[PDB]
Amino acid sequence: KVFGRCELAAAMKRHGLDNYRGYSLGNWVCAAKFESNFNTQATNRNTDGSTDYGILQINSRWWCNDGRTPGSRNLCNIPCSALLSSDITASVNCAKKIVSDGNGMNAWVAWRNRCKGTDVQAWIRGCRL
Ligand code: NA
């Protein structure tokens, strides 16, 4: 599913991301935009052989099981395919684990490079929430 901007903001707010670990909703919307272009079925193979999955491009090296990333962990205890659903529950619950891990949202390279330090509120402007 390809979410619209305000559609995803509202969904992310219902799933508990607004201000989660101090990150305002616009941070999460900005990250999703640049990770996946709001597409829950986005996948990207990394050169280390791991794969990123879903609207927040969560990586199989640490976070989910895909059966083809040797020596990896599955810290969110999910198949990676769960991160591709139209239902964002698995992606949100796993993102909550990631952002709690010590480096905050810096774990998302696209957030650090394209969202961090910007007026992320623009991402939720004009939305009903
Ligand atoms: Na894994």
Q: Beta strands 51-53 and 43-45: pairing type?
A: antiparallel
Residues forming the active site: 35, 52
Q: Is 115 helix (H, G, I), strand (E, B) or coil?
A: coil
Q: Is 119 annotated as a binding residue?
A: no
User: What is the CA(71)–ligand 1 centre distance, in A?
Assistant: 8
What is the end-to-end Cα distance of the chain in Å, rounded?
A: 20
Radius of gyration of the chain (CA): 14
Burial class (CB in 10 A: 0-12, 13-18, 19+), 71: exposed
The whole-angstrom distance between residue 1's C-alpha and the CA centroid of its chain comes to: 14
Distance in Å, CA 5 to ligand 1 centroid: 29
Domains annotated for the chain, with CATH where assigned, are 1-129 (1.10.530.10)
Residue 91 token pair: 């992606």
Residues 85, 24: Cα–Cα separation, whole Å: 24
CA of 24 to the centre of ligand 1 (A): 29
In 1-129, DSSP assigns E strands to 43-45, 51-53, 58-59
CA–centroid distance, residue 48 to ligand 1 (Å): 12
Q: Can you give the resolution of this entry in Å?
A: 1.5
